[PDB]
Amino acid sequence: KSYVADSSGQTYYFDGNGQPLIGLQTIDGNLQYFNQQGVQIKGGFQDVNNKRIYFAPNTGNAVANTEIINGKLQGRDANGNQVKNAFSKDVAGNTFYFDANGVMLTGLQTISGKTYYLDEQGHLRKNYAGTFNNQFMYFDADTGAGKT
Amino acid sequence: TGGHYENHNGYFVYIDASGKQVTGLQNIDGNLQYFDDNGYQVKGSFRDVNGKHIYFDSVTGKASSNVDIVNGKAQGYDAQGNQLKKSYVADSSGQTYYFDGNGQPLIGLQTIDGNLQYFNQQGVQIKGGFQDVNNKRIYFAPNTGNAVANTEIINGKLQGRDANGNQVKNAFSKDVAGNTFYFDANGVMLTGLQTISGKTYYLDEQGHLRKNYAGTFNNQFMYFDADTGAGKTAIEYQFDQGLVSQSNENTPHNAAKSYDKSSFENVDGYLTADTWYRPTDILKNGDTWTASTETDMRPLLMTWWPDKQTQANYLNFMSSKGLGITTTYTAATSQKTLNDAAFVIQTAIEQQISLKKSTEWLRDAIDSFVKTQANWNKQTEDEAFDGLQWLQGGFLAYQDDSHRTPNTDSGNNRKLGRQPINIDGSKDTTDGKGSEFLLANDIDNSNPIVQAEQLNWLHYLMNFGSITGNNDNANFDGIRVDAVDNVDADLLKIAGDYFKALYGTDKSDANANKHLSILEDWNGKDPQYVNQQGNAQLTMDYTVTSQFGNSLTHGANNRSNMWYFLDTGYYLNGDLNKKIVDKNRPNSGTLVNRIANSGDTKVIPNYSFVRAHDYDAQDPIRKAMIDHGIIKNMQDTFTFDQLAQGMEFYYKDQENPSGFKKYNDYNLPSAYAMLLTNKDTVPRVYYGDMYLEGGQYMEKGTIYNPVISALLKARIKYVSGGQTMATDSSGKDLKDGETDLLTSVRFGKGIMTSDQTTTQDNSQDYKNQGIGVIVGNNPDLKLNNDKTITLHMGKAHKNQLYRALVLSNDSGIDVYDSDDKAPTLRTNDNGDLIFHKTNTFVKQDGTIINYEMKGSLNALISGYLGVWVPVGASDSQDARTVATESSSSNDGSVFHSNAALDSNVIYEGFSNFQAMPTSPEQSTNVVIATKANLFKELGITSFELAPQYRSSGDTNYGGMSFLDSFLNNGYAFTDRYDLGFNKADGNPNPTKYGTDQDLRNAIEALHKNGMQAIADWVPDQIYALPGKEVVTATRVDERGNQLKDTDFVNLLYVANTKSSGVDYQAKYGGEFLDKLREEYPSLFKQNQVSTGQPIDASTKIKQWSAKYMNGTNILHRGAYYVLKDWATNQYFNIAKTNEVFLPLQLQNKDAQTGFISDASGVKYYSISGYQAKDTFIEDGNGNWYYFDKDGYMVRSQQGENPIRTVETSVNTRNGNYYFMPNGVELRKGFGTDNSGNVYYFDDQGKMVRDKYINDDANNFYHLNVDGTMSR
Amino acid sequence: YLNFMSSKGLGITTTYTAATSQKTLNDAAFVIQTAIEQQISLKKSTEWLRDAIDSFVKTQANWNKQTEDEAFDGLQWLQG
């Protein structure tokens, strides 16, 4: 019931019997994946079951991430479900918003009666002041929502 | 649970199940959130509740860890709002602090958990950069922040920095990427070949140390170590086993008493890892050798092993069970030592046999050990889950291999994936090839003998009552074809022509319709093939089932508009005014256009549904169990108790008054309203929409029951004539007034158009017929005050009074059983019922009523639904059209979509997730008999019964069990002809649904009530066959295509393929064919498409075996469970004494094993004593070698190319390898040829071509087509 | 100051912020002054307070090294 790093800095988890876990496993709250050889997947996607999940670079924990499918950015949540009508992060730390059709949004966007500013790259901008509606608007450091 | 989320002025509010707006901290459905005094929700800010300081996330508003500047200083906090001590915390901007014993952040250099880290003046952790701490200079890692060696470019020269921040001089040092460099006395990185401390290393142009790199460095070959990159000469042989004799004083004793089936447990003559044999003598009690008696069997692995690796594992494993000194033995261990050790284990074994007076304990020890080994478990079977492999872990295709496995040869049959669109194999190279493999053992339906047997079974079912009870009223009338796309499409023709011959289905609609038959045919091109072939069975119409998913049935919020139901593209330019049909579209659209269907243009006859036993049931019900932790995987095995618990949550979710549904489908009444009013379709109704899918059969009705029941009885009364369909909508996007509310109308018996005022035959039936349906998918729909919505009931219904059958509102859907109890409304001169935002309706006598055209949300709807009928309907009014006896059509076809066919309704009267009957009286088919009446009066003309076949149950010979099997639903079965017969001891043995008598009584009862009974025809597979055979097998995907990266090709495998031969398949198999060939010769003379052959009744199938199968799901036995000699690659066998092949130890001959040099080269002998020829061999230290046809290891010469092309008996291994002077195969590394060109060789030694290749240190290289490295 | 003196048993232990109303803080400084004069009479001394003030003063960034930009590169290695 412990992790071990080998010579190459690869990571296994051995259970109650000393035998390595394979496949999807939940360590406490943490969700992790293990390949058929018992090695922990770190810093990459992985098609477990029906869904598709990204696992973090050093912790190896399941988290939201974005990848470019065809020529369009797509968003992936912590459960491996693609994101529609919601905000989702990538591992770098940027937040994006994806519409009903799963496509990332760009520019100034009014959602649920509040207004957020997304740059050319689709990054949600926080602590950003600018004349957005041709009228001054400061975008919150908290949630990026426009205040007057 | 049970409170909705609302957004006001940009903020989230939560309104309770109580109906109260929520303030304060609240754990809602497992998420911790906060709302201020106005009831708005907080995100990306900290709040104080009790003595807790809790941050909530900026996206979700969910409680999680952060750092707050509190007064002057930084302080960390957890998810529950406790100040953290001696822990890391990451803040909102992804930055990291470490807070000490007092909660105060550490600053400057520090060591934690053996890791050296730095913190800036504010206490933030430095990551991914250098840092001048003290006098020195240290790099800290990107994510961990731990101190590590790194290199930076000073001036134009790379420099190296170690973990302590000192620059590196006269040593090796890494960079973060992973590359090693060497730096000289003057600190400068070195290049090229370098000799340091009496050893030589190769550094490329970039100064990277190259490991596992072969190349001619001194003009003389040199292999650079995988460990440290130090050059070896590769002249010393690395194998540690010289040629040794194994024979000794025990050989003759442990030798086999006989070389045949007497003395060897076997399958089809071959041996397996867990084979036991009869040794000549037995070391009884470990004391005295005594001749063996027939019953004294012992395990092969006590005496023999396939390789030293396995031998060493056996010894260590048995040691661990108390049998010997516990040992660490490796393949490197000398053979002599291992063999001596095996005998001391043998001794201990014989001692525990005398002590326990048993061998069962050993059987279990051997079994356990055998599954330890990768070659004898699934790891060598390439488990995968993409495609239909999702079900069972992957498939094996059996092969025609007359040399090794002749009982298993199919006679050049096994045509795979001859689905409708690929019946002639013309799409075998594309994705259009059918997925022949689905579940369990896939039957070879491309073999004419098997095709005949499927027809025998078919006849048996259509005459089940005559055959099993001499009751001619207990016979099935039609069929459902399970898994059409996974079988050879010949079966359709076979079935079609049978029905033609016996029932004259191609004569008339009355004959055709007396034997209603349906197809589970999911491919999008199946409908048009079925129609080209004359519609012998009805195709499904997925296009409508699909659109229900998108527009009503699936999801909340985003849904396709109701507009999509029209498929306006059917008409040219979507011009409803002009209505010119589009002759040449991209082969798309809904199957039957219903915008203005006057019955004038012929369409493909079909059945349609909203749900099925296997559509929108299986997945939801399991997602529910997963979500409540009852199982972990969709494939996981679950018990009935596990299912019952999960079902409670499923039901709770289904009937949720909130109106939100996590697992269940939305708008089901509204979906059925459309299904049951549509022209040119035979609707099918799912038991599970009427009664609950779990527990006992008909135990409790669903909430939707009354509404759907009403729709069904009204369909008998009012549904006939032409149809129109429109929406208050023009496309994806809605203009100002537009509601996207759909209006569907039927006119009455002879009325085919809006503007038609009377029938041609002057029948008056039409006046009290017809129906109006209005449906929306928007529960928040509110009309403009101006807006009016219209049902054009038609010019045949001028000035007529209409009354509601069904109306939605905010608490449910009201259902009106008769004209008096319902609100009426009268049509105008043109025959339109006009509706406004606000309506005041009058009952015919009773009262005046108020009603808003308002979207609603509750358990029974998320949208709008209104249905209206003409008042004054007779009690026995019947709008159906009876099918005519005349030969209406010379088109050749069987079914025709018309008013007669549309007068049918199929009821799929079972669920896969029903519980097992608690008593005989509650068995499904007993209940069906007593309740037949009820279905007559809902207008069901055909009752689709579950598959009646005896469940294979919990029986499982290897590989993944499936839910069909362990839930006993009847899709997984062992005996195809056992439908609930008693045990031969006389005792009852019902299926899940009851005995054979219960079934015949159930079928008769349906005929007594004017309904047909449909038999589920399941020709694709059969489960859990008790007898083993040895097949030749290749690992394949659903389509029977070999996996790309598999070495499992044409290997011998023990499968479970043979039937009991004393079952009902044996009794009734092939019996009725002779009778039928005599009576209808043409059936047996007609050629099938896929084969060019007719069916072959010259051979009867009373017992299944592998020769009639295409394959199986993987059985977790291993690629080499069937034992083989590595040297010759010949498998051991003892069937026929003329062609015996055994290890020489077992024949008391001398088995010599090991590597031996001679003047020509090196040779190798396997443990079984044979010389290695034309095979690859792995030594005890893990190195691989290739021995050519002559028997000599391949090795590179001075001045010659080390790269050698191999063509072996083992085809999968063919390729280009790089053999060093001592014969070692290069693996996972670069190799230079004699000319200085570099190539790369993969995990298995093979050359790689035409692709980019990546490195753990992020170096990228390219390999051209010819193999060379561009880089 | 109010939080620090509170923690020594001199008042209700408090989280006060710069956001707290000036009125509330001033009232609270007086209830602390009162508590102070009691422990001065009780101990008949002011040294205890001298040590309490010293300690509190160095708590504050403007009154300790944090606003002095401590560095150790070059000869600054010797004394900061």
Ligand SMILES: OC[C@H]1O[C@H](OC[C@H]2O[C@H](OC[C@H]3O[C@H](O)[C@H](O)[C@@H](O)[C@@H]3O)[C@H](O)[C@@H](O)[C@@H]2O)[C@H](O)[C@@H](O)[C@@H]1O
């Ligand atoms: O003990 C493991 C490790 O813990 C720290 O590093 C963890 C992790 O911290 C960052 O990412 C965390 C993540 O947290 C929230 O989701 C934020 O809102 C995100 O912006 C943020 O990324 C950091 O980015 C990662 O690089 C890092 O792995 C300590 O720093 C380590 O020393 C310690 O070993």
Ligand SMILES: [Ca+2]
């Ligand atoms: Ca098949």
